[PDB]
Amino acid sequence: VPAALKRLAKYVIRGFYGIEHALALDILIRNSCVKEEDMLELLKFDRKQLRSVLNNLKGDKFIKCRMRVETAADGKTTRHNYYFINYRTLVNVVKYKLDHMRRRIETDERDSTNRASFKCPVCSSTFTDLEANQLFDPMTGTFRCTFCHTEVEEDESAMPKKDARTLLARFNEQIEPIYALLRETED
Amino acid sequence: MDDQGCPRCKTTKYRNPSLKLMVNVCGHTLCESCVDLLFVRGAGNCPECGTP
Amino acid sequence: FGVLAKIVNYMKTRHQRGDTHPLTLDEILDETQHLDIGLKQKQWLMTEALVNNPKIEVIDGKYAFKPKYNVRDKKALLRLLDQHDQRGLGGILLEDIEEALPNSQKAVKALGDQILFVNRPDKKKILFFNDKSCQFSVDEEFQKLWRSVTVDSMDEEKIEEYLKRQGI
Amino acid sequence: SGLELYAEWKHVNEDSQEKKILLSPERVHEIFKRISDEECFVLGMEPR
Numbered sequence: 001v002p003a004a005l006k007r008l009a010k011y012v013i014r015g016f017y018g019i020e021h022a023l024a025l026d027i028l029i030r031n032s033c034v035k036e037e038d039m040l041e042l043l044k045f046d047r048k049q050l051r052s053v054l055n056n057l058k059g060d061k062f063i064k065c066r067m068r069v070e071t072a073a074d075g076k077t078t079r080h081n082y083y084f085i086n087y088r089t090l091v092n093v094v095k096y097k098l099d100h101m102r103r104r105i106e107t108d109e110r111d112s113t114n115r116a117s118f119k120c121p122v123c124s125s126t127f128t129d130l131e132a133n134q135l136f137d138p139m140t141g142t143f144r145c146t147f148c149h150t151e152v153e154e155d156e157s158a159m160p161k162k163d164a165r166t167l168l169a170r171f172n173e174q175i176e177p178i179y180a181l182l183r184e185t186e187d
Numbered sequence: 188m189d190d191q192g193c194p195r196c197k198t199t200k201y202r203n204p205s206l207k208l209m210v211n212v213c214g215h216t217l218c219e220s221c222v223d224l225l226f227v228r229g230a231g232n233c234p235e236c237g238t239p
Numbered sequence: 240f241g242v243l244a245k246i247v248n249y250m251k252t253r254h255q256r257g258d259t260h261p262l263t264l265d266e267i268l269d270e271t272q273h274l275d276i277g278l279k280q281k282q283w284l285m286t287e288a289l290v291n292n293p294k295i296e297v298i299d300g301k302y303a304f305k306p307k308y309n310v311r312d313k314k315a316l317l318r319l320l321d322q323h324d325q326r327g328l329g330g331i332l333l334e335d336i337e338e339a340l341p342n343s344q345k346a347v348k349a350l351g352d353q354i355l356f357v358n359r360p361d362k363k364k365i366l367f368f369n370d371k372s373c374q375f376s377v378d379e380e381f382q383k384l385w386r387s388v389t390v391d392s393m394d395e396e397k398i399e400e401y402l403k404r405q406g407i
Numbered sequence: 408s409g410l411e412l413y414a415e416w417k418h419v420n421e422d423s424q425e426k427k428i429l430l431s432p433e434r435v436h437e438i439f440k441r442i443s444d445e446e447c448f449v450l451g452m453e454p455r
């Protein structure tokens with residue numbers, strides 16, 4: 001394994017996945033062709049626990065399997081499952097999630113700035129900006145409601161408004177320093 | 188790239204390397220994100236002074 | 240076996256009292272007051288019982304141990320677990336450290352985050368060696384978006400079409 | 408087989424082993440999205 005593929009495969013398995021997925025990968029890095037019974041005696045895991053961890057890597061298009069049908073000394077059919085780190089698919093799978101994780105923040109932010117900005121703190125009614133021509137009272141200079149005469153306020157300060165947008169927009173820029181060590185190596 | 192600053196959005200250069208940047212007449216550099224974000228909020232005013 | 244289980248029990252229990260020296264077979268039957276067992280039963284358990292044991296150790300004229308082959312040392316838990324990573328020999332369970340090393344709750348907590356823990360269904364822990372040369376960790380909400388991307392119900396050649404459509 | 412559909416492959420050229428896996432409901436959803444207008448008239452359906 002090259003120095004770029006070995007360093008990239010170790011940083012992803014630690015931060016993203018759990019600890020059980022990283023302990024079963026260190027043996028696959030030092031040794032490629034590893035038998036199925038070797039990862040159970042060295043790691044001291046369980047038959048049902050190790051199978052659930054290996055299925056998560058195989059399901060994520062990371063490693064494959066090469067079955068063998070031969071004959072042992074006793075005369076029975078012996079089947080093995082050789083698991084090795086296959087870099088012929090893992091390269092595009094990592095880049096596939098990076099495009100959706102980057103667009104998920106942009107979609108949730110674009111679909112949150114355009115909503116509303118008026119709410120009555122009495123009747124708890126979420127109003128919009130397209131009803132200011134009918135909810136205005138010229139005898140007082142302020143806004144009112146429909147079925148009652150109460151004063152409205154904002155709309156629960158939590159959405160990216162004129163000033164709160166900078167706080168939520170800079171959260172996306174924090175992904176660059178935490179991933180620059182992993183993106184520059186793959187680039 | 189990111190050392191010159193950014194007007195309104197401020198979070199655009201770190202999202203796409205191949206970003207479409209534009210220029211004006213007074214002497215500034217505004218990307219394509221600040222063009223649509225400022226039009227829906229105001230119009231075509233200079234973020235530092237007053238250039239229509 | 241019942242007789243073999245009694246010899247191994249007394250061989251290890253007496254060592255933890257304050258005796259650090261190899262023992263044989265006549266010493267056990269004399270200290271435990273079990274010498275009157277016969278001559279046919281003493282010779283039968285000498286050249287067959289202690290010989291069939293695959294983990295037995297014979298230094299010269301006595302007998303050593305079998306659950307632990309390393310000598311006692313203070314700074315030895317970190318050095319022993321480090322050899323399993325640089326060579327690939329496997330790992331050591333928690334029941335092996337608590338049995339051979341008395342009071343293991345002090346040396347493990349003193350090292351800090353140098354040894355990773357494994358949660359087994361049968362309530363067992365596995366002691367490994369956390370490599371400090373490669374460390375990476377993110378927030379809790381960052382790991383949720385990584386697993387939310389459905390990549391199991393797709394295809395290998397299908398991913399290449401989506402990446403070449405955007406530009407990467 | 409009740410409420411779960413299965414699949415059995417048999418390629419007598421390079422994979423003689425009969426593969427048996429459960430058909431995930433997300434697999435048939437990605438294929439139906441690719442069906443265009445010219446392909447719905449064959450089955451007897453109208454996209455509109």
Ligand SMILES: [Zn+2]
Nearest residue numbers: 120123145150
């Ligand atoms: Zn009201």
Ligand SMILES: [Zn+2]
Nearest residue numbers: 196199218221
């Ligand atoms: Zn901008």
Ligand SMILES: [Zn+2]
Nearest residue numbers: 213233235236
């Ligand atoms: Zn100016």
